[PDB]
């Protein structure tokens, strides 16, 4: 069972927030999910991860424990691209991709 990444398409304007929802909760509950931006030539570019890998892309967990809000604060026009949320079981599972548009 892989993670989810909704909505499939997210059209926001230039300046406001943009938030996706990565729904994932495995059979072990010992997981660390990443938030990568896929390049036009299939070369992921990690943005953030939960728990916050300390070393504008927010990652907050909801009370249900299965949904995670991945937010792009003050979405710039260059942020339009492909995004996905991976999941690592302590093994990796990539969620379905999704598009992000910024008018």
């Amino acid at each position, epitope marked *: 069972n892989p993670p989810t990444f909704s909505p499939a398409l997210l059209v926001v304007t230039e300046g406001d927030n943009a938030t996706f929802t990565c729904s994932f909760s495995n059979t072990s509950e010992s997981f660390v999910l990443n938030w990568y931006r896929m390049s036009p030539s299939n070369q*992921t570019d990690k943005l953030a991860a939960f728990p916050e890998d300390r070393s504008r892309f927010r990652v907050t967990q909801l009370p249900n424990g299965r949904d995670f809000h991945m937010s792009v604060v003050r979405a710039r026009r260059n942020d339009s691209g492909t995004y996905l949320c991976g999941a690592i079981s302590l093994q990796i599972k990539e969620s379905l991709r999704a598009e992000l548009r910024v008018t």
Partner: antibody, heavy 118, light 108 residues
């Protein structure tokens, strides 16, 4: 394409300062970090330092006070200076691009062997 | 300075067989670890980024794993063009140290 072309002198006299350069082509030099790496004869890879898009650098504690990494944005070049050179600096220096918000070294340079000798 | 220690200094599995390489860090470099392949004379080549995702144009036979201080690089079926040195690299904190390389050679 995405490249990194290194160029420097073949020889370096002991106690002098070694000057290197990494001419870039393909990507916005003000949007990617360039990392210098050393490869001594018959040995592995050793990190020398980085230069981010803002213009700040991080150096190897063992190499600090001798390394200097700058960049000429109007020329798409990254410079590497090594003062008070000894016979230990003889190696193959590599410049490499850094990709991602949580960076990783993707593209590498061609390499430039430096022989510290008289 | 985090110490990247590759365990199999020299690996010589046969042709077409599985071949894994371990690279353990002395501290938590949790998922900013990249793998590189280098041949004599040529510069390094990247294979795995973030320790799981494989780079573009990289054969499918390559796989990566690890999240703490336990990283691995796996080759499903070893090919003749795979003979090279494989270096791991940490990007967690300075001095972003590397491993020491694992020489991968073919037995025939």
């Amino acid at each position: 394409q995405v490249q990194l072309q290194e160029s420097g002198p073949g020889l370096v006299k002991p106690s002098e300062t070694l000057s290197l350069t990494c001419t870039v082509s393909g990507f916005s030099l003000t949007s990617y970090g360039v990392h210098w790496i050393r490869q001594p004869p018959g040995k592995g890879l050793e990190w020398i330092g980085v230069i981010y898009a803002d213009g700040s650098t991080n150096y190897n504690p063992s190499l600090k006070s001798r390394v200097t990494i700058s960049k000429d944005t109007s020329k798409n070049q990254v410079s590497l200076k090594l003062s008070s050179v000894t016979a230990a600096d003889t190696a193959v220096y590599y410049c490499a691009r850094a990709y991602g918000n949580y960076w990783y070294i993707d593209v590498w340079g061609q390499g430039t062997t430096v022989t510290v000798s008289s | 300075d985090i110490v990247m220690t590759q365990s199999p200094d020299s690996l010589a599995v046969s042709l077409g067989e599985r071949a894994t390489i371990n690279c353990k860090s002395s501290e938590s470099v949790s998922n900013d670890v990249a793998w590189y392949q280098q041949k004599p004379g040529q510069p390094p080549k990247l294979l795995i980024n973030y320790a799981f995702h494989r780079f573009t144009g990289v054969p499918d036979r390559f796989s990566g794993s690890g999240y703490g201080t336990d990283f691995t690089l796996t080759i499903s079926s070893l090919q003749a063009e795979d003979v090279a040195v494989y270096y791991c690299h940490q990007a967690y904190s300075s001095p972003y140290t590397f491993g020491q390389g694992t020489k991968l050679e073919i037995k025939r």
